[PDB]
Amino acid sequence: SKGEELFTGVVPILVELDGDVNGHKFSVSGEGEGDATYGKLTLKFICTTGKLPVPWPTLVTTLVQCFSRYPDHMKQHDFFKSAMPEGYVQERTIFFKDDGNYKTRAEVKFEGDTLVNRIELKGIDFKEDGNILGHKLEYNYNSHNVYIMADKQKNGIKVNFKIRHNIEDGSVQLADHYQQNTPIGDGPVLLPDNHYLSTQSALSKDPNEKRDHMVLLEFVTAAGIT
């Protein structure tokens, strides 16, 4: 593809998040770098508000997800690098068991040389003593599989994947995701088949910072056709 040649080297990534749940206004502004040749993600999320009500491990698979390492025999089944540098509207609606639901809307596009993306996180109807809001989960994120399907109705890709989170009691929490990527431009857009990738994230802290943050280190590596 013509858009895959623009991801050669180090490209700066700008994270611009602004959500509002239960009347609590919060904004997350982070920055870092990326690599699409070998699949390396290096970001540093900085909470500009302070005390974030929603947990951190539940907001990992949000932005980026475009610097993946695709094999030599899977270059024709790409969608994140096909709408470049036009961009695509990434809309998701994360569900849960018996709690609430999320509603994000990302616009992964370039403005010259730095990847700028804005997400308007919405969603109401939550609890005050469950996993969300109340600090009950731990600070760890294991590996998960992301299955990518296909769609030929509204010209897009319907990504469906189910992950899980940990706590401090012994239960198992299951979540549902319904990602719908819609391109912006009307140029050459490829149509991938069905394949799954990998996710090797890593969360830590930083003694040289007083405010809340999240040191994320994710390693994305593609596999094959399921």
Binding site: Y38, Q200, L217
Partner: protein, 493 residues
């Protein structure tokens, strides 16, 4: 112009301005600049690929093991984009080879995921961790297979499977054979005065393992059973977690019974071919690095002929084609039962015919000879023979019969007891190492009866005789450890 010396230094090291780094370092700028991310200029000088910039920062006082917020040392970025001349410079000033980031992956794993060829051989020369794990439990072998590498999925495994053999047949250690199944331990535990229960079979194996600490450098490998690995000790620690903690390798018996042939005269085979690909993926995670493939061979009027040799030539090669793709070291044991009556001129003739077809099929099924072990039987006459021989004539024909078929690529060659006496098996072993012949391989002991004969008669079947049964095992462990080196003098034994 001269303000912010740390911000302007990272800009020249990122793009590759060689005419701007020397000017900043000649005035009075900090070589270890720490901005909002704590990224030292050494990372940008090795990630993009500029060897000239690295040679200047190292001659001033830059930290080679400077960890940032993600714990990524500059050694990781030096071997990421695909550069060889940069990694060879950082390894000369004393760098952290076992660097661990947030997950805990050594720089050796990054050379296999990307696609490095000559860079992998550089990290294995100074000394890197072979069995390096992390939070996910993946080493440098279960990752390169899913990627699709040819010079990394077959060459890197040749070093991991061969390094374990050096800690088994080492001059001083040995192999403890103890894989008595349910159809073999009941015979020895019948004429003594005991029975065959689950408690008797479990307590008997704990006496030879959990004992005195003077048997650690003398025992390198312990052969167990599939049921033994699923049992724990009385202290609270599993069996594999005790052998590897003192300096030993845990084994497991994988071969089953025997199957008689058709139209022969007592020729049998070894069962254990089906389901091999499903058992190697589980025994490796438990702590088993080898096994024990025992066969049944006898010498009669016409056995073996032109059928038992060809049949066993393919079974011994097919087993080594699956265990090497997981992490199990195959051990070929061409045991020949000295049945009937024969002299040294006849027993040696049969040995040269069976061993000639062993390594013949190994060169076809792609078998790494420098990472396998062989357990051949001694050249001893039959029990019905009337002509006696000394200890020097037996060891003379034993070494000669092995140098004709066994290639020098074998790490170590072991032996068996031959069903003889306990003391006789230790005297004939010392005469083999004292033979005036150049032996390229190593020799050690690997008995399966003489190493535990004294610990069975004096044990009885009670609980107060635990200190009396472990005392006889110390004398047998030190006697066999000296016969493999050439300094064994039989005093009062």
């Amino acid at each position: 112009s001269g303000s912010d010396l740390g911000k302007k230094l990272l800009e020249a090291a990122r793009a590759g301005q060689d005419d701007e780094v020397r000017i900043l370092m000649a005035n009075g700028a900090d070589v270890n600049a720490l901005d909002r991310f704590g990224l030292t200029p050494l990372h940008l000088a090795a990630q993009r690929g500029h060897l000239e910039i690295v040679e200047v920062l190292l001659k001033c006082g830059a930290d080679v093991n400077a960890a940032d917020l993600w714990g990524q040392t500059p050694l990781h970025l030096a071997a990421t984009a695909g550069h060889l001349e940069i990694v060879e410079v950082l390894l000369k000033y004393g760098a952290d080879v076992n660097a661990l980031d947030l997950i805990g992956k050594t720089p050796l794993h990054l050379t296999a995921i990307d696609g490095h060829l000559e860079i992998v051989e550089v990290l294995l020369k100074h000394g890197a961790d072979v069995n390096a794990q992390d939070k996910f439990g993946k080493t440098a072998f279960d990752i390169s297979i899913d990627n699709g590498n040819e010079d990394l999925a077959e060459i890197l495994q040749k070093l991991n499977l061969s390094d374990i053999a050096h800690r088994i047949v080492a001059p001083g250690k040995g192999i403890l054979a103890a894989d008595e199944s349910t159809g073999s331990i009941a015979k020895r535990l019948q004429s003594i005065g005991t029975e065959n229960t689950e408690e008797n079979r479990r307590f008997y194996r704990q006496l030879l393992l959990t004992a005195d600490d003077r048997v650690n450098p003398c025992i390198g490998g312990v052969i167990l059973f599939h049921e033994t690995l699923y049992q724990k000790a009385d202290d609270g620690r599993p069996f594999p977690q005790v052998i590897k903690s003192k300096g030993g390798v845990v084994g497991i018996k994988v071969d089953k019974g025997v199957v008689p042939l058709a139209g022969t005269n007592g020729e049998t085979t070894t069962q254990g071919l089906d389901g091999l690909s499903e058992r190697c993926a589980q025994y490796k995670k438990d702590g088993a690095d080898f096994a024990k493939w025992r066969c049944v061979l006898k010498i009669g009027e016409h056995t073996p002929s032109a059928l038992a040799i060809m049949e066993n030539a393919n079974v011994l090669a097919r087993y080594a084609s699956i265990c090497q793709q997981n992490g199990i070291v195959p051990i070929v044991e061409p045991e020949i039962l000295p049945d009937g009556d024969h002299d040294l001129k006849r027993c040696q003739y049969v040995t040269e015919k069976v061993l000639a077809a062993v390594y013949k099929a190994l060169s076809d099924h792609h078998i790494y000879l420098e990472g396998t072990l062989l357990k051949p039987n001694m050249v001893t006459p039959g029990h019905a023979c009337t002509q006696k021989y000394s200890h020097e004539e037996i060891a003379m024909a034993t070494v000669t019969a092995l140098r004709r078929t066994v290639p020098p690529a074998v790490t170590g060659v072991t032996f068996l007891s031959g069903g003889q006496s306990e003391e006789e098996a230790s005297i004939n072993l010392n005469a083999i190492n004292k033979c005036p012949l150049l032996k390229p391989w190593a020799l050690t002991f690997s008995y399966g009866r003489a190493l535990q004969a004294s610990a069975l008669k004096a044990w009885g079947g009670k609980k107060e005789n635990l200190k009396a049964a472990q005392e006889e095992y110390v004398k047998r462990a030190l006697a066999n450890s000296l016969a493999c080196q050439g300094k064994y003098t039989p005093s009062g034994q």
